[PDB]
Every structure is written in structure tokens, then in C-alpha cells.
Amino acid sequence: WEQYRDRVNMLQQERIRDSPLLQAAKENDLRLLKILLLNQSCDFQQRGAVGETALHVAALYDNLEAATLLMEAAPELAKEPALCEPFVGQTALHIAVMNQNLNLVRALLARGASVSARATGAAFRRSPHNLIYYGEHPLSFAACVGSEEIVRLLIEHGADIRAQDSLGNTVLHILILQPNKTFACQMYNLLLSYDEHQSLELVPNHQGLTPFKLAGVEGNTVMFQHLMQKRKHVQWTCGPLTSTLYDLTEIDSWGEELSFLELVVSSKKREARQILEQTPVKELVSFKWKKYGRPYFCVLASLYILYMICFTTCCIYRPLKLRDDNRTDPRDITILQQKLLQEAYVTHQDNIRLVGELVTVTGAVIILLLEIPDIFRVGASRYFGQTILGGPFHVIIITYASLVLLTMVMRLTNMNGEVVPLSFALVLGWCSVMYFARGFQMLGPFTIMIQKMIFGDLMRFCWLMAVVILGFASAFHITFQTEDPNNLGEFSDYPTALFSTFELFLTIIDGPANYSVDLPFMYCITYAAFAIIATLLMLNLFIAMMGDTHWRVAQERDELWRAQVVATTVMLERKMPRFLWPRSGICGYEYGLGDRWFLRVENHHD
Amino acid sequence: WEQYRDRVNMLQQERIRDSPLLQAAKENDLRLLKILLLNQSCDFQQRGAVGETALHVAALYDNLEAATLLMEAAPELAKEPALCEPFVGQTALHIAVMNQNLNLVRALLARGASVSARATGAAFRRSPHNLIYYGEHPLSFAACVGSEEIVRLLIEHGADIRAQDSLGNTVLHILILQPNKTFACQMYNLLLSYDEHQSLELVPNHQGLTPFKLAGVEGNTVMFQHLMQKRKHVQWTCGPLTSTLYDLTEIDSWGEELSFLELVVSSKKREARQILEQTPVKELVSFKWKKYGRPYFCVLASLYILYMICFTTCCIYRPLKLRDDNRTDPRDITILQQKLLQEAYVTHQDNIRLVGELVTVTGAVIILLLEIPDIFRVGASRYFGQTILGGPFHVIIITYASLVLLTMVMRLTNMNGEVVPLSFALVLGWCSVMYFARGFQMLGPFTIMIQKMIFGDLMRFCWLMAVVILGFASAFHITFQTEDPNNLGEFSDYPTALFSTFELFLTIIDGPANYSVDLPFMYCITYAAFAIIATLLMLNLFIAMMGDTHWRVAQERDELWRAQVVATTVMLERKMPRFLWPRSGICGYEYGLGDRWFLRVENHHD
After folding, report:
1. Which residue stretches are annotated as topological domain Extracellular (chains A, B)?
2. Chain B residues with CB-CB distance to A436 below 8 A
3. Where are the domains of chain B?
4. A508 closest CA partner among B434, B504, B501
5. Pick from A236, A333, A603: which is nearest to B61 by CB?
6. Best residue in A419, A464, A496 to probe B by mutation, most B CBs within 10 Å?
């Protein structure tokens, strides 16, 4: 992209330098402008590399005199935009409003330039290539640069408020998408003042988001607290304490297929979860979590724990018979094998294991029925990537259910090797019990912190560890390759030496030392080297690195846990039936407020 | 609670909106007030949902003109309060004084509203549900809002000083219970100036607390140093150093059944221990600890240590005989059994063990005689919950004494299994030696720090640990369920596999590796997974988590240790006899100061 944009800018400057009218409109050299604009033979419709006119060049460098003599020479240049690929619909109005000068915009609207021109180029799209996103209209441009007089001039010269760009964003959507939020709050106030002449606060874009929902997703909290000034009503104020009444129509979103809180918690932005700490939202999600979220989550946690005890008990009592084949061979310790299906269920305890395994299989089926439409409904990268929603826990529960169904397939068809999917299934299901740790303050941030160092320091330590494992595994294997394996069998072969020095990295098993024989002298030297640079240096520096990372990431995980119980509450509200979750808030139709639901907040000041 | 309070507020606003007189008194629409108050047919005694009148609505929204025309129409509305459940006795005076306007309070006292009205509703009680606690009287309301002219106006219109609410709190009690302490000290000075016309600084509430004792329990130190301005006398000032004389009548509390320092150290508030760092109290408790508390605590510590040596020596030399039953069975290593009671005491060394066990039993009896009335005197949740008083040490002392008495029961009646209560008794008694570590600066904060890590990170690590223990215990048990237990017996059965992977989590015993046999290939994979995510990840992140928590909690344990020796001193002063602890301070009757005891403090300034 960047080479193409650089070539576009250098070609634009080259055709500015080549054309003398464009070059003099750039430098505001007035006498040569009077000579060339006096000449009839000079073509005034000549274009640059992107197709910009001389009026575009005069508006680009804030040359008011050059521009006003160009429209005295040719007013029709106020109508023509650029016509190439990066600036598909950029007029002189866009550059004049962006450059923020009143006289050029006044003269351009005096000559009759079209206000509803859409700058549909690739440089005006909401792209991470582009530095800014100001929209496609001069109305959105005047809102984004923050000029009050230019946007009032555009309103009195036209500029219909309900104008949407290629993404369907209105002017309030783009104003929410800007930085410097307090400087855009008065712009939102002025455009809401001009909106009164259906409402534009309730119309969506092509993504389906209202400006309230876009303020929730983008996470700009100053704009959210400005938008809830119109959705609240102070009931009374007594002494230091007031009671006010927030509206839950735009926040709870009962009848909508996509709710506000779901779009806040399933958002890619870092600052979206701060919307959950705002004064109409935090008490609502705390009420929802304390009344219905926490007991239903504890019931589901205890049910999954009892299901894990059932699955573990069925794995312990698995059908095994004696080995029919004669061993007649050293190093072999297996004495039992898997029973066939015709002999697996012959007794009463086998029938108890049968109904327990049926409970296990039916449980894995209802897990897949709960989780597969959640995979298909929202984006799968967002479903497995957000730690607020519980992505790694989701993929290990999918893997556990797939391994249980693979076990059911290999139990129906008698093939050996069932112990390996029972092993990953037991490990993954019990590690997936930890999804329910987010409902507790004692267990929640610790579980977030251990997943953040699953994806953090442990991967770089496994790379820089397996480097040392390969090198010292090769050295330990070759220094005992000429020796007897019956006297020191830690490094007899190369996978054994690899696993052995993996255990000796972590100081799990002892260093191999047979004091009744003479070990090679090279083994002591390379083991002194391995003991210094790996067990003493690298392991304890891994401890120091997670100790350094803990206090840096502690604020993030503490502010992400209280964003995690909100996503748990939103999941539990839509997955569970409607009769177990009554509608939150206060019914206004009981008190004559007109079929709207409200949240009453009593707070203390002074 | 909160749904009921929200329903009360919405019903109150609904009956405000339904009644036109209440609605116009809310909005201060004066012309419709003149029309309706001109009409004789309009009922002026009509009430809201909580029973408030129109004068209450006019005082709620600071409508002075609406209120004064309502009492020109009906002065008798100044007398009626609300009469429902949340506002049982709220008058218009309470709302007018809370709203802080002089003219409405002046006009309400002109119409004859009763000053001694008690607002005995549930919204005025000292509850965690209520945001404020301002009392029940307009005198206490005027003191709590901090308006001087309103409370002087109430004094000239009545407002007796010795008025107590439903908790027995006077106006000085509620003023101590407020925040913004320096703003309430001037109100305390004003009410103490009006108190001179028995004293209210000496009267208790229903809990039995003076305002001095309530300032100690609540822990507000600015009010404490303001209250000790009247209880101190500067003797002289020479150069940069002054000698002053504090009064120890309200602080030491010799004749009282409940002392001041005991109520400070056995307080649920976090800020109570800062009262122990104040300038009359800190030198007093330092003199009490240095002169009497530390030698008596060291004598008690040495006596308890010698009693542990006696109990340990009696546990080592316990009567054991040879096993009469023939073994005839592998895996059995027991060769000795418990002697019967008729053969336990036949020799001289058995008599030495007998008198040592009598010392042990008599010691456990006198421990129970010291400790059981301490549980029965103060609250048992406060006795076992405060780490300043030593709650966990108290409950393991009760458990140790109960296990010694259970041992005495099983020694008198010859039943096998005495080694298990000797095991918990030895562990709990030696861990209850650590109660005496609080008397030393080197050992005290470390013992508080290990106590807060018992009740902090170890419980969450045990939950997130036992999850991994259950999963990898199940996996390790099933991957060796088909193998010979004689070659690798770490995971032969499921409690053995559970204990084995518990030791493998903490890297205590080595990883099970028999190099003379071929282990299953799945064991190496799941042991590599267990070695990465548990021994490398979770254990060292537990180290990092207590390393992060240590510098956060270090200030708390350092300021809680010097609150712990004060509670030790208060316990040692009342448990021990009176002749070993003489009365602290300086006897004024020797110097003619009139049967009061004083503490002289010489300090340096400039």
C-alpha cells in the first residue's frame, strides 16, 4: 500500500511542478496568476496526477487570493472533484473545510459548490492505512475538525443531517469515532440541536450499530456519559444524596437481537470494558450478577463438577482384562489390555459404568449443542480470541467433547488405544473446570493471570528452553553413547535423553550419578555447564520475569475480571430460558411512565 | 431491600404526579397553587404513598414560595409527619434542615412545628442499606449537615441537647459517626458550648459507649485529638521542649468493666488501630508493654515452650509393645502396637511419663479454663476473626486442648488409634507456639504475613492446584492402569496417584522413571504437559503472586503488629492478677490533683 501512496503523492507534486498554473496556485505568485488567468489560451480544466484542479491546489496550501482569482476566472471549477483512485470524490470544499478558513468556504459556497458531494476515495475510508477517518461529506469534515462557524455555514447552505457514507456511518457515528472526546461533545450537542428540524440517534449503519451502540463498542466513556444526560431523570435531591432514574431502553436491549452489553463485552477495543464501569451500567450488571448471575453460575459450576466426578469415575473403572498374549520379552510391563465390547458389559458394576458413560456421552452432546451455535453466531476468531468471553476455555471444552465422542466411536468399534483420548479428555475437562473460577473474586483474576502467562512468558521460555533441551540432549546422548545403558540409562537413546534433560532442566528428577562406577569426565563438565546456565540461570530468571510481569499486568487483570463477570452474565441471560431471568429494572407502565424500563440510582455527594 | 425501596420511591413519585397540589408544589407553579389553595373544596390533608403532605414535597424541592403559601393556607401541615414504613416520623423540618435553607426553617418554626419530632423510619436507621446516618432529630440533622445558623436557630427554638435516638446515640455520637471530621469538630465545639446550660460526654448509648469510646471504636483520629485538648494540661514549655499532662481517666479505664483500649483493639473498623498511634495513647501502651507486657509475655512464652517440650517428650516415649498378632501378609510393616492401660504404667520411666502426662492434661485443663470464658465474654465471631486478638491461634489452641482431652479419654478406655490425635496435637501445639512471636519485632510481622498468606493466596492456589491434581491424577492413574505396579508403583491406585501427583506438583519426589523397563509413551507426553503447566508455570507464578502481594501488604502488617502488642498488653492486664500490674500513670492525689491519674509527656518542637 505505502509504495503506491508514496508514488501517488510524488506524482501529484510532479504534476503540480510541471503545470505552471498549479505551481503558481501552490506558491500564491499573484502576478503570474494574473498573466495566465488573463490569457484565454490557457486551459483551466487541466488536472494533476490524481485529477485535482488548480482550485484544489489553491485550497491545499491556504491560498485564498489564488483561489478567489481562479473562481473569478472559472466558477465551474468549484463543481469538479478529483477523479482518480485515491481521491474519487474530493472537492475543493473538503480541502477548504479541513484547512479551516472561513473566507474560502464562504466563496466556494458563493460560487455554487455542491455540499452533498461524497469523497468516496480510498484515502477517506475507515482504514488503518489512513491516519484519520473524517467521513465523506464536508458536514462530517466540519464536525471532525471541530469548527462551529464552518458547520453552521454548511447548515445554512444545505448539508442535510441524515447523510451516510459507504460504511453507513452518519455524522454522529464519525464524531463518536474521533479522538479528543470533550472537544467533540459540543459538536454532538450542536448537531443534535440541528437534528430537530424518526431520529438520527436511532438509525444504524451497515454493521447495525446505533450511535449509542457505537459509543459502547468504541469505548469512549466521556461520550457515553454525555449521551446518558438525555436518558436520565433526577427524581429528587435531599441533602447530600440524590435519587435519579436512568433509562434502560438503550442499555438492556430486551427486544433487540443484538444487545448493547454483548457488543460491549465482545469488542476488540481495549477501552470498551470501561463502559461497564459507568454509572448506569455498573449497578445494572451488579444487580444482574448478584441476583441471578452468581447463583445460576454456582449451580452450573457444581453441575459441571459432578459431571467431572462421573466422567473420572467412569475412566477409573474402565473395562480391562488380563493379557492373553505371552510376554517372553524384557522391558515389557503391560499386564492388562482393553476388554472387547461383548465382554465389557456383563455384570452389575459394568451396568453402572454403562449408565455413567451414557451420562458422559449425553453430556458431551449437550455441550456441543450449546457451544456450536455460539461458534456459528459470533465470529469464530472473536469467539476463540477474547479472554473476556473465555476463548481458550471454549476451545478446550470443544476438544474435550470431540475426544469423548472419539472415545465413544472407539468403544463401539473395538480398536486399541482408548487410554490416550481418555488421558487428554481427563486433563482438558478438569482444566476446563477453571472456566467457572471467573465467578469468584478469589479465583478469577488468578485464572486470568495464569492464562495471560500461558500466552505470555511460557511460550518464549519454551522456545529458549527447547533450544537448551536439544543442545544438551544431544551432548548427554553422545557422552553416554559408548557406555553401558544398564548402569546409567537416562541418556540411552535420543528421545530418552531429550525427556531426561527436559526433566533435568526443571530439577524434577535427580542428576544421574552412579557412584559405584566411573562416569565419563565429559559428563561432569557438560553437566556443570547445564547446571549453571539452565537450572540456576534460566529457570530463576523465568521466575524473575514473571515476577516483573505480575505487577505490570495486575491492573489489567483486575480490571478485566469485572469485565468478565459481565460477559458471563450476558451469556447466562441469553443461553438460559426467559422464565429464570426476569427483565431487569423498574416497570414504568405500573407507575404510568409509558412502557419503558428504568434503573433507579441513589447516590451521595458533597 | 433494594426492590422495596425502589418501589417506595416510584410509588412516591407516582402519587406526586397523580395529585395536582403535590405536583404543583414540586414544580413551584404558583398560579395553579393560588387557584387550588383558594378553593375550599380541595382537601389539604391528602397524602402521598409514604404519607407525606404537600409541605413535604415543597420542602423536598426547595420551593420556599409553595411552602409558605401552603402554611398560609394550612399551618397545621407543619405538625403532621409521614406515617408509613420507610418514613415513620419524618416531618417537613427534617427535609428543610437537610436541604439547608434558612427561610423555610424560620417559617416552619414560626408556624409551630415540633422540634423534638423523632424520624424513626427505616431510612434513618444506622444501616448499611442507608447511605447516611444523620440521626432522628432535626438537631442531629443540623449538626450532620454542618450548618451553624440552622442549629443555633433550633437551639433558640428548643432542641434539647440530651436527646437520644433508637440506638441511644446522642448528637455528639452521630457527629463522631460522620465523615469530614474537621468540618464536624467545629460543630462539636458549638454543641459543647451549648451543653453547659451530669455531662453528655459521659452518657452512653444502648451499646454502652461514651463519645470518647465511640471515637475510639470508629477510629476517627482528628476527633480524638480534638477531644484530648480538654483532657490535657501543658505543665511548662522551656525552649523547644514542652512538658504536658494528659488525663488517663477516659483512656486507661481502671474501674470500668469494658475498657477503652480493649474496645479499640477489638474493633471491626480498619482505622481504629490509628487511635493507638495517638499522642496520649502510644506512650501509655509503650510504657505498659516495655515495663510489664514484654517480660510477662516472655515468661509465658518460655513456660509454653517448656510445656511443649514436656508434651513432646511424653509423645516420644509413649507405651508401645510388640505385635502379638502374626503378620503372614506382604505390604505390612507395622511391628508395634499400643500397650493396654494395665501394662502402660509398670516401671519407673512409665511413672515419669505418667506425671508428665498429668502435667500435660492439667495444662490443657488450665488452657481451657483461660480460653472458654474469653469466647463467652466477647463475641465468638470477633474472638476467632480478629487477627489483632489472635483468632486462628485461639482456635488451634482450642483444637489442641480438645485433642489432648480426647487422647486422655482414649488412654483411659483402651481403644486403638491414639497416634492420630497425638499427630494433630503435636502439629497444632507447636504451630500455636507462634502466637508468642507477636511480642518481638523480628518475628511479629512475619507471623502476620504468613497468616495473611494462609487466608490469602494459599486458598486460591489450593483450589487451582487441586483442579490440576485431580486431572493429572486421573490421567496418571489410567496411563499405568494396564502396567505392572511392581515396576512403577507411583500410580497403582487412585489415592496413591492423587498423593503422587500432589508431590509431583510441588517437585518434592522425583518423576517416576524406571530406565530398565519401557514406560508407556503417553506417560511422557502427559508428564511433559504436567511439568510445563504446573511445576514450571503455576508454582513459580505462585511465587511471583506472593512477591507482588508482599510489598502491597507490608505496610498493613507493619502497622498491624504495633496494634497487636497493644491487644497483647490489654489481654495480659486483665487475665493476670492485679498485684502484678500496678496502675499506669501518675497518682495525682499524691500531688493534690484530686484522685485522677495522669500521663506526663515531654516532647520537642521547633
Report:
1. 317-353, 411-416
2. none
3. 1-278+584-606, 279-583
4. B504
5. A236
6. A419
